[PDB]
RNA sequence: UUACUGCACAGGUGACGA
DNA sequence: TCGTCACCTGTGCAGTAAC
């Protein structure tokens with residue numbers, strides 16, 4: 070019946086008395102806040118300046134007096150609540166404001182972890198993990214047309230290495246290459262400094278410097294990254310460092326796991342509710358009960374979408390709750406029509422790895438047998454092919470080569486293909502040490518580039534994967550096979566969808582931001598992905614081949630109008646038919662872009678048909694969490710004491726925050742990885758207010774389904790493929806744009822139906 | 828770069844207004 | 846240029862693979 074949130078009701082006054090000045094230029098605001106400081110809360114909104122009196126006594130303020138009622142204008146007190154929460158928690162210094170964010174005053178988890186594991190080191194006290202709480206006052210709608218303000222509690226961990234760089238050098242951590250940040254953050258200045266090249270007297274030598282090429286040892290510390298933590302502590306702790314991380318994991322789980330998080334939120338509410346919260350001298354707020362999403366009595370705030378069905382035939386008869394279980398039984402969705410039943414696959418690999426690659430290829434093509442039931446059949450039988458023919462392309466290249474690996478791979482590929490006839494796909498095996506080389510000499514990207522140019526999609530793979538123990542390898546090979554099949558134009562599966570209307574197009578856009586280093590400014594690229602409603606299931610459409618960020622809204626507009634035109638020709642819509650277009654992204658579109666997109670599509674389809682249009686943003690990092698106290702979780706593994714996903718809402722749970730907003734649970738206890746995995750965070754789904762199609766519950770469930778459409782993996786994706794695929798495309802095409810001899814010429818020819826971006 | 832998941836840090840950025 | 850509310854994107858490390 071009920072999903073509990075991480076938020077509490079805030080009992081506010083019905084009305085607050087305010088003073089208003091017209092203030093068209095908002096630049097005067099900062100100085101005016103400063104003048105009236107301590108005595109007035111000041112807030113700029115809609116060309117006017119609102120003043121709420123906090124404390125009797127001057128300065129005085131000229132303006133028009135007005136009663137601001139909370140039910141009608143909750144943004145005023147919501148804003149004041151941001152400041153009042155800080156003032157209500159005086160013993161807690163704000164590490165950030167709006168939302169007020171602060172550290173636990175005592176708890177420090179590295180010390181606690183060292184004690185539980187029985188470790189120690191004279192430098193351990195300089196490594197800190199401190200619980201970090203935030204309090205976000207948020208407007209929500211307990212029912213349509215009525216707003217309220219709630220305070221939402223979130224918890225993270227601050228990682229910080231306060232150790233002097235001098236003390237870390239001795240001994241004997243190699244600080245070279247490590248990123249380093251300012252120790253005191255001057256207001257509005259960058260934290261990042263650069264990487265450590267060397268340290269001498271009192272100065273650090275920086276490369277990839279953000280400003281000055283050197284900084285005093287006293288003004289810099291290591292950035293609190295997991296990388297720096299692991300580098301430092303493994304050097305200091307050696308064999309025992311693993312004991313510390315697992316202990317640290319247990320510690321953090323004591324804050325993050327379902328019942329532990331619910332308890333921590335409970336405890337925070339009790340603390341906040343102990344006294345009134347002072348909105349002004351005269352005016353008090355009161356933190357009340359935990360906010361719930363339920364269906365009682367006038368509220369309709371929670372529902373459970375049905376299980377997504379993975380579908381493997383056009384009749385809908387062959388379906389399954391799980392991708393792999395389904396693919397195992399039925400084979401792929403397009404098995405009866407799949408053209409290339411004898412694919413020829415080029416295999417490019419370092420000559421020294423021959424034996425390992427053959428073992429991998431055999432496992433891949435012919436399976437691992439019934440001792441490894443996750444991948445028994447192998448690619449050929451799995452997909453219902455007749456066979457796979459490998460043309461072996463060894464490369465004389467060693468891992469120690471870091472400057473000429475890519476040229477050796479590409480020369481070998483060119484020489485092999487020149488005499489080998491036609492290949493339909495490639496597998497490229499990479500040394501770990503080459504995987505993350507800069508792009509000008511990175512063999513992943515150069516071989517990707519060359520083969521794509523030639524119209525040959527690739528599935529690449531790093532040697533540590535090639536060398537996985539069999540129990541892990543079987544799962545690797547599931548994901549490898551699915552993506553490879555789709556790279557061969559295959560359609561592994563679809564997801565259930567019933568009719569509803571005459572045609573439905575979903576287009577997504579995704580962003581990548583590329584640079585050669587953290588110091589070089591990131592360049593933006595976009596990708597576009599389309600999905601069509603099919604007979605009884607969704608079908609993946611075509612994909613963008615151009616990636617320029619500038620003019621991206623024209624790109625969306627042209628994609629949609631082009632597609633609508635073709636859909637109409639193809640399907641021959643009858644007068645009165647209804648067509649729906651949905652847009653997905655991780656950010657909202659501009660109102661002006663929505664107007665322009667809606668105008669153009671409406672004009673393109675014309676007046677014979679009805680058109681519905683929705684613009685949706687999918688958010689991951691918001692302050693909302695769902696707790697299902699009825700959920701006991703599952704054993705961490707068969708069949709232990711520990712449980713995983715305790716209190717995790719079922720997948721497909723959808724809660725109403727407001728008219729335009731839903732929370733969508735995606736990670737159920739089954740999908741939750743381990744006992745220490747935190748209570749999952751739902752996706753926030755938000756409808757653009759200018760949308761003409763308004764059913765955000767439908768749109769939330771549609772997003773859920775599209776999460777199951779990913780052919781990169783048997784497990785669902787973190788975000789719908791309309792966005793996810795677009796990000797992968799934008800990143801690849803963005804990187805390829807800088808690789809010499811790259812051409813997109815085959816993306817819409819040989820690769821038009823290839824899912825080359827997986 | 829089989830992936831999924833989590834987290835951390837860093838960079839900032841988007842949308843709405845006047 | 847501004848205020849205001851909000852959260853996105855990149856990178857690296859670790860545990861696990863919906864029955």
Ligand SMILES: C[As](C)(=O)[O-]
Pocket residue numbers: 070071072371372373718719722723
């Ligand atoms: C209907 As329910 C609160 O179990 O998602």
Ligand SMILES: C[As](C)(=O)[O-]
Pocket residue numbers: 173202336337340
């Ligand atoms: C000690 As407390 C900030 O969780 O109330």
Ligand SMILES: C[As](C)(=O)[O-]
Pocket residue numbers: 427428430431434459
């Ligand atoms: C699949 As083979 C190259 O070991 O015959």
Ligand SMILES: [Mg+2]
Pocket residue numbers: 157158159160161
């Ligand atoms: Mg206090």
Ligand SMILES: [Mg+2]
Pocket residue numbers: none
């Ligand atoms: Mg406790």
Ligand SMILES: [Mg+2]
Pocket residue numbers: 397442443444445446447451
């Ligand atoms: Mg099998």
Ligand SMILES: [Mg+2]
Pocket residue numbers: 468499500501502532533
């Ligand atoms: Mg290697």
Ligand SMILES: [Mg+2]
Pocket residue numbers: 679
């Ligand atoms: Mg009508």
Ligand SMILES: [Mg+2]
Pocket residue numbers: 552781826827
């Ligand atoms: Mg891939």
